Amino acid sequence: TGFDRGLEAEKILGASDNNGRLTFLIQFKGVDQAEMVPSSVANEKIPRMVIHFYEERLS
Amino acid sequence: TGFDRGLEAEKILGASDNNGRLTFLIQFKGVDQAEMVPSSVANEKIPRMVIHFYEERLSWY
Numbered sequence: 001t002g003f004d005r006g007l008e009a010e011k012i013l014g015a016s017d018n019n020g021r022l023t024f025l026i027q028f029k030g031v032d033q034a035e036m037v038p039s040s041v042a043n044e045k046i047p048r049m050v051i052h053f054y055e056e057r058l059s
Numbered sequence: 060t061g062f063d064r065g066l067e068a069e070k071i072l073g074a075s076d077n078n079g080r081l082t083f084l085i086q087f088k089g090v091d092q093a094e095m096v097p098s099s100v101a102n103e104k105i106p107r108m109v110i111h112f113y114e115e116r117l118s119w120y
Contacts, residue, residue, distance in 0.1 A: 017118065022114065039114070043107070043110050047106045047107075047110060048102070050110055051102050051106060051113070054110070054117070055081060058074070058076060058081070
């Protein structure tokens with residue numbers, strides 16, 4: 001919903017799977033508190049950042 | 060890669076890291092033998108299928 005407000009995602013701070021439903025914790029530029037975003041929104045809005053997160057967490 | 064020849068990715072069969080370098084094994088439609096593709100190509104061409112592969116890999120690992 002920082003996406004709704006047209007903010008710029010800076011990084012994905014974490015991912016949490018709740019019974020098959022994935023949520024990301026996303027740090028937005030110019031916003032102090034990180035925001036919980038469902039994977040359904042993140043996959044669409046910031047796919048390169050999602051892939052890089054998974055790629056790096058491949059460790 | 061198979062992407063250069065107009066082929067369509069059917070399924071990502073696996074991923075291999077070689078010193079920070081990730082390569083995917085990709086099943087292409089109508090081609091029996093799956094082929095290795097650098098992540099840099101797969102990320103650009105088939106990001107929905109890349110993401111889905113990671114969602115599932117990680118749900119089971």
